[PDB]
Design a protein around this ligand. Structure first.
Ligand SMILES: Nc1ncnc2c1ncn2[C@@H]1O[C@H](COP(=O)(O)OP(=O)(O)O)[C@@H](O)[C@H]1O
Ligand SMILES: Nc1ncnc2c1ncn2[C@@H]1O[C@H](COP(=O)(O)OP(=O)(O)O)[C@@H](O)[C@H]1O
Ligand SMILES: [Mg+2]
Ligand SMILES: [Mg+2]
Lengths: 521, 269, 529, 49
């Protein structure tokens, strides 16, 4: 007592009350993103401490914007970032699934069941559910170009049906599919030019077949040079074409005034030597990361040549794999094989802004999205919604395997586990059986968000599955059940396999914890 | 690439030195736990001039913290960004000088200083090649000034061909926070004349008038104190002498002369 | 009312805030209480049925771990008597690596059992002498209990069954898959001389799908992209450099001096043409991949892309040295072409994406390399760290088997058999020390008690059953875990064995930390600050 | 910035478009159903213009 072990302030708890209070802490995280699921989901509005509003319907960004400090609840926020890093879709379906695996086993913890028995049961059910999906995953033979385009259009249309752009899901799903076949093997995410221009209508968004970047700072004389070319030759450079000192570490020590005048003419001859070398090469458009002075701007205005400067690095690299040049740090070698080429180049006005276009590239391997909305948060929600169809199609090329949705695959798994549980005896019946009753949370939320009778519909789904309709999901327009495979509601098999493994690992970790210790400060 | 180390002494030197590391750790994005979570390439080309890397990605500084009182060491340890210092680089005493320049120079500064040179060696062994030292101390209190004057003298002797910069502090212009402040300052400036390469004063190589005001006021109080020989037995009794103080004022007058600004019998000649 | 004054002497000369605890009722009996509380915190995490612990330090960083040493490291302790028990556990981690909880359990039972002896009359010196006599006896009995030593440390079917016990004690359920990863990586980097090094096994964590997706890879991997444009080479010649890839400048302050107009025009062209020859000189040796450790130059990057060369930058110093051993190259302190012995030959260098992370892989087709890495994948940043430590326990077990191949039956079959032989020895010693030796033997029952309490069975029946079988002669009988009722099971047949060197150092360090606490009589503490 | 004329006419129509939906919500009508019927009308008015 006079000498104490830990510091004054070390809060500690343990036992049955410690674990039950953790199951009730994940019920708050799951209820924050419960009403953003399905075609009739509603997005939320969060405000930071400064006053910036972030309006979104996706679980991953909602849970990132809450200052959750509970150690038990911070596991559910960490598995959401895992899902949006591997597959990019299904983020809010692993949050309800993780909380439903803990609510169903809450009464068994209170009765005095050893939690190690629960962890063995959870791991046995996951391995038996993941293997069932691969057994009944639909695939096709000889996926030809036509049938391999329809398959990705249906998948991209389904990931878009629950987002802000739900009326124009047909128009957008045609642009995303065409935007990924231009890439070749690695499918880099930095080769797609998401640009946001204020003003316009949602149907005015365009996809270009080249590059497009905003007009940068320009000096005097920029309005004296042509702004439309037929067959230019792009000269991608990295040089400062401006009158400056040759080296920061330099000094000149002249003795006579005759050598004074020759020095002043030497700096004007160094600059004019670089400009002449560019003009002799036949180039018509020049770009440069480093700035372009006004003397170089008026040099190119008197020869009907376009100039640009201070281009970002992310935009010059997108030009190279669209035209076919190379970045040159020196002008001493400008051959025919280090220049670009296109079919049209102009500088139009969109929404009170000047943009440069480089359309007409038959060997282009990159694209660019121009998004037209009406507010700052209209474009951010459209960009985040487009980021989900990009990763769905990217994952769907490496794995041409699809399953039906709308609860059609949650219900087939719960039927298979209920049949398996009735054979094995012991306490595994009440644990596997509790695993099968938790998989029907997905269909229940679809009928609760739309405003349906969640109990009568579920009685019909459980009867259609036990007869033996494998892909019988739900319908929101018909107030009934229907065949979701023939209704063209498709999703890759990799969005459910990773959803069960992430949800089972998060639930098994929370159960095993016995006590927590918080240290001061 | 010409790596440099730091030495912090006294109560005043530790407080400023603790906050000096703040501007570098955050600028280079060094986490309070010692890890690195920066997102720039310009924060890594010069990371080795001030930090020594460890196995697994730990970056420890290159500072040595010396003091004659153990009560000023745990303040930095428990404060922010105090966990990253090397545990072996803490050198503390048990007695304290007590505003005594001479007690912290010969009678009791002669034992702990041997515990500091062995520490600066193991740090200088790990570096590829070093170019100089950085030391921080005070000029009013004898705990830091006396220990620092000996410490700054035992660094130059072993490394006669290495530069060394100081960031000393100077006493207040009008008010004085200690009775024997002029005694502790004159005896320390003349030992920094031929032992330092660049010194800085924070309130012919002295930076911050032309510093002429600072040296003028110190010698005015010192001369008035020495005329009456007041409080002189505290220094002579432990090993000093009268001529030692005479050389301090004679040398102090020379530096004033180098810092240049630019009777009733006149009948025949 | 009246006030009791201060007793003259030392109590009147103490500084304020300091405390003084002298005597047997104020220093010894209170030190045992602090150390008995420490044993009840880490006991719950013992055996396969142990439970995790949520620890948060003062940086608001969260730890979900089951190691005994890691829990003590993230817990602050302000009791001096409980601090020696911590430093006794941290010493076994650096010598053996496994057995940190054994010290806490043993030093917690030796100290508590000594309190009862101090009330029946025995002095402190009689207890210390009694424990040391028993400690030497256990070091002679222990070698006689060794069974089933290691046969071959280069077979993938034998080593995998020897590390399984170490893993199963920390990740129950995944002990079959995890044991096949460590065994696949330790035998690959095992040299012919037999000198095993622990730092040659690397672990990289990539947030991904699940634990079953983890895999081993003979080579190195980095969390960085490629500086140049070439991103795949089939058969590469790596030329590692330690100097930055740019022009050479003097360390003294130097400047140019242009005095004529003619020298001003040729200066810029001179530097560029100088750099073309230096880069082309390396390109003629076949060096497809150049790895630097400094700052890359803009002009130097242009010529790198011209000759189809791959440029990789690693600003981590020691990470650069690890690459020199993998490919068999040497770091060049100067920007000069290597001649014959400074060219590392790899089998494939490419930039790939793994779970949204662009990485560079120095893959090798040969199994005989210097450094091997293990790629760990999981769903939570906490789950991967917990498995990081479990891998390290398996690696440290392989190092001990290199030194000493002798094994003992685990699962409590060693402590009970050590309790029977020590108890009989103390019966033949007439005197005041026979009470201390008997209490030493009863401290070995705290380990099987901790395994039975954590499983969910009555402990008193387990020790009752173990003592009867061992008396007949079955020294290879331990505790059953899969059985719901408190039954027993043979351990040599089942395959639960521990290292002889792991337990030999556990008893020596536990008894040393327990006899030092009893020797303390007076405690003089200063003012906390 | 897109046209330049009509910037006080849009906020009047949008404000009056929200007020008319207040009665529909009170009768038990899902908001997504309202936002779905509005887009169909805007396709009839534009094609008529
Ligand atoms: N046409 C449809 N009819 C019924 N349900 C659908 C339809 N399309 C999608 N769904 C369901 O809506 C859900 C979409 O949830 P969503 O908000 O996209 O979650 P996340 O953002 O985490 O992917 C899917 O689980 C799917 O079952
Ligand atoms: N399958 C098993 N059955 C019975 N005992 C086991 C089994 N696996 C490990 N043990 C025992 O658990 C004990 C403690 O292991 P652990 O707590 O992980 O590390 P430490 O040895 O540091 O306490 C070991 O001494 C070992 O004998
Ligand atoms: Mg979705
Ligand atoms: Mg172990």
């Amino acid at each position: 007592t006079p000498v104490i072990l830990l510091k004054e302030g070390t809060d500690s708890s343990q036992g049955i009350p410690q674990l039950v209070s953790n199951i009730s802490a994940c019920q708050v995280i799951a209820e924050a993103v419960r009403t953003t699921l399905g075609p009739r989901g509603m997005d939320k509005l969060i405000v930071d401490g400064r006053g910036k509003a972030t309006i979104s319907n996706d679980g991953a960004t909602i849970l990132k914007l809450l200052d959750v400090v509970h150690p038990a609840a911070k596991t559910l926020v960490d598995i959401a970032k895992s899902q949006d890093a591997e597959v990019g879709d299904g983020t809010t379906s692993v949050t309800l699934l993780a909380a439903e695996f803990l609510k169903q086993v809450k009464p068994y913890v209170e009765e005095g069941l050893h939690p190690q028995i629960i962890i063995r049961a959870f791991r046995t059910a996951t391995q038996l559910a993941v293997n069932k999906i691969k057994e009944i995953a639909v695939t096709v033979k000889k996926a030809d170009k036509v049938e391999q385009r329809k398959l990705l259009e249906k998948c991209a249309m389904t990931a878009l049906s629950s987002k802000l752009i739900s009326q124009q899901k047909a128009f957008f799903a045609k642009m995303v599919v065409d935007a990924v076949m231009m890439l070749d093997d690695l499918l880099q995410l930095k080769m797609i030019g998401i640009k946001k221009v204020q003003g316009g209508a949602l149907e005015d968004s365009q996809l270009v077949a080249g590059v497009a970047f905003k007009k940068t700072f320009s000096y005097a004389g920029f309005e004296m040079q042509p702004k439309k070319y037929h067959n230019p030759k792009i000269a991608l450079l990295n040089v400062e074409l401006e009158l400056k000192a040759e080296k920061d570490n330099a000094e000149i020590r002249v003795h006579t005034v005759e050598d004074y005048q020759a020095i002043v003419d030497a700096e004007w001859n160094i600059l004019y030597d670089k400009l002449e070398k560019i003009h002799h090469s036949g180039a018509k458009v020049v770009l440069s990361k480093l700035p372009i002075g006004d003397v170089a701007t008026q040099y190119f205005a008197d020869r009907d040549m376009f100039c640009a400067g201070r281009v970002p690095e992310e935009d010059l690299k997108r030009t190279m794999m669209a035209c076919g040049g190379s970045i040159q740090t020196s002008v001493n070698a400008l051959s025919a094989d280090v220049l670009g080429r296109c079919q049209v180049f102009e500088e139009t006005q969109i929404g009170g802004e000047r943009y440069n276009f480089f359309t007409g590239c038959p060997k282009a391997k990159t694209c660019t999205f121009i998004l037209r909305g009406g507010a700052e948060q209209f474009m951010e929600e459209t960009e985040r919604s487009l980021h989900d169809a990009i990763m769905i199609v990217r994952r769907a090329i490496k794995n041409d395997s699809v399953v039906a949705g709308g609860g059609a695959i949650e219900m087939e798994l719960s039927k298979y586990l209920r049949d398996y549980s009735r054979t094995i005896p012991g306490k595994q019946q009440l644990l596997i059986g509790a695993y099968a009753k938790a998989l029907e949370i997905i269909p229940r939320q679809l009928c609760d968000n739309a405003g349906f009778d969640a109990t009568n519909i579920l009685n019909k789904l459980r009867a259609r599955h036990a007869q033996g309709g494998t892909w019988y999901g739900v319908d929101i327009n018909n107030e009934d059940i229907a065949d979701n495979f023939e209704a063209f509601v498709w999703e890759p098999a990799m969005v459910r396999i990773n959803a069960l493994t992430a949800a089972s690992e998060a639930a098994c970790l929370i159960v095993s914890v016995d006590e927590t210790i918080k240290n001061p400060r | 690439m010409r790596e440099i180390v730091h030495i912090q002494a006294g109560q005043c030197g530790n407080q400023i030195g603790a906050k000096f590391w703040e501007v570098i750790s955050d600028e280079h994005g060094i986490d309070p736990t010692g890890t690195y979570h920066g997102d720039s390439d310009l924060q890594l080309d010069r990371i080795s001039v001030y930090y020594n890397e460890a196995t697994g990605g730990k970056y420890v500084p290159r500072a040595i913290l010396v003091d004659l009182e153990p009560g000023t060491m745990d303040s930095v340890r428990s404060g922010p960004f105090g966990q990253i210092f090397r545990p072996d680089n803490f050198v503390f005493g048990q007695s304290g000088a007590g505003n005594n320049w001479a007690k912290g120079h010969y009678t009791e500064g002669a034992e702990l200083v041997d515990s500091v040179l062995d520490v600066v060696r193991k740090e200088a062994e790990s570096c590829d090649c070093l170019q100089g030292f950085q030391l921080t101390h005070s000029l009013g209190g004898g705990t830091g000034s006396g220990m620092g004057t000996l410490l700054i003298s035992k660094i130059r002797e072993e490394y006669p061909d290495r530069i060394m910069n100081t960031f000393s502090v100077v006493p207040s212009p009008k008010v004085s926070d200690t009775v024997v402040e002029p005694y502790n300052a004159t005896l320390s400036v003349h030992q920094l004349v031929e032992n330092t390469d660049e010194t800085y004063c924070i309130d012919l190589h002295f930076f911050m008038t032309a510093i002429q005001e600072l040296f003028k006021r110190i010698s005015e109080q010192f001369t008035a104190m020495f005329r009456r020989k007041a409080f002189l037995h505290w220094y002579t009794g432990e090993g000093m002498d009268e001529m030692e103080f005479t050389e301090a004022e004679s040398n102090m007058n020379d530096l004033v002369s180098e810092y240049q600004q630019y009777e009733e019998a006149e009948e025949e000649a | 009312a009246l006030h009791v004054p201060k007793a003259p002497g030392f109590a009147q000369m103490l500084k304020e805030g300091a405390k003084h605890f002298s005597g047997l009722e104020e220093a010894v009996y209170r030190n045992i209480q602090a150390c008995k509380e420490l044993a009840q915190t880490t006991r719950t995490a013992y055996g396969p049925n142990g439970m995790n612990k949520m620890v948060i330090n003062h940086l608001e960083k969260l730890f979900v771990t089951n190691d005994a040493a890691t829990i003590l490291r993230e817990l602050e302790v302000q009791h001096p008597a409980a601090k020696m028990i911590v430093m006794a556990s941290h010493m076994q981690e650096q010598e053996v690596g496994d057995g940190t909880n054994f010290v806490l359990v043993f030093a917690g039972a030796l100290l508590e059992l000594a309190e009862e002896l101090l009330r029946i009359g025995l002095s402190v010196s009689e207890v210390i002498e009694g424990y040391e006599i028993a400690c030497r006896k256990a070091h002679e009995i222990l070698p006689n209990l060794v069974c089933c030593s290691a046969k071959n440390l280069r077979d993938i079917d034998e080593v995998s069954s020897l590390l399984r016990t170490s893993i199963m004690s920390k990740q129950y359920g995944n002990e079959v898959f995890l044991a096949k990863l460590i065994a696949q990586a330790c035998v690959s980097i095992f040299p012919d001389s037999g000198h095993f090094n622990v730092d040659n096994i690397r672990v990289c964590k990539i947030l991904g799908s699940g634990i079953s997706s983890s895999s081993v890879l003979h080579g190195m991997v980095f969390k960085k992209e490629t500086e140049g444009d070439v991103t795949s080479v089939k058969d590469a010649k790596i030329a590692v450099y330690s100097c930055p890839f740019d022009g050479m400048i003097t360390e003294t302050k130097g400047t140019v001096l242009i005095k004529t107009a003619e020298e001003l025009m040729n200066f810029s062209k001179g530097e560029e043409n100088l750099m073309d020859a230096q880069v082309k000189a390396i390109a003629d040796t076949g060096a497809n991949v150049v790895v630097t450790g400094g700052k890359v130059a803009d002009m130097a990057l242009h010529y790198a892309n011209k000759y189809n060369i791959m440029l990789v930058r690693l600003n981590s110093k020691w990470d650069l040295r690890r690459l020199c051993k993998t490919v068999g190259a040497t770091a060049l302190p100067r920007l000069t072409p290597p001649v014959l012995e400074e060219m590392g030959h790899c089998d494939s260098v490419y930039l790939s994406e793994v779970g949204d992370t662009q990485v560079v892989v120095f893959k090798h087709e040969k199994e005989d390399g210097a450094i091997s890495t293990i790629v760990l994948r999981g769903s939570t940043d906490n789950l991967m760290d917990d498995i990081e430590r479990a891998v390290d326990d398996g690696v440290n077990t392989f190092k001990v088997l290199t030194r000493d191949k002798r094994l003992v039956p685990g699962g409590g079959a060693t402590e009970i058999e050590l309790a029977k032989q020590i108890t009989s020895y103390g019966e033949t010693c007439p005197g005041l020390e026979q009470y201390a030796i008997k209490k030493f033997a009863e401290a070995f029952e705290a380990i099987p008690r901790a395994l039975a309490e954590n499983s969910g069975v009555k402990a008193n029946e387990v020790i009752s059953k173990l003592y009867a079988v061992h008396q007949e002669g079955n020294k290879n009988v331990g505790l059953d875990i899969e059985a719901e009722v408190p039954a027993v099971k043979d351990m040599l047949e089942a395959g639960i064995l521990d290292t002889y060197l792991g337990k030999y150092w556990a008893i020596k360090l536990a008894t040393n930390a327990a006899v030092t606490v009893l020797r303390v009589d007076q405690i003089i503490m200063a003012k906390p600050a | 910035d897109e046209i330049g004329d009509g910037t006080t006419g849009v906020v009047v129509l949008a404000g009056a478009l929200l007020e008319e939906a207040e009665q529909l919500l009170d009768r038990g009508i899902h908001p997504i159903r309202i936002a779905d019927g509005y887009e169909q009308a805007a396709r009839v008015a534009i094609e008529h213009l």
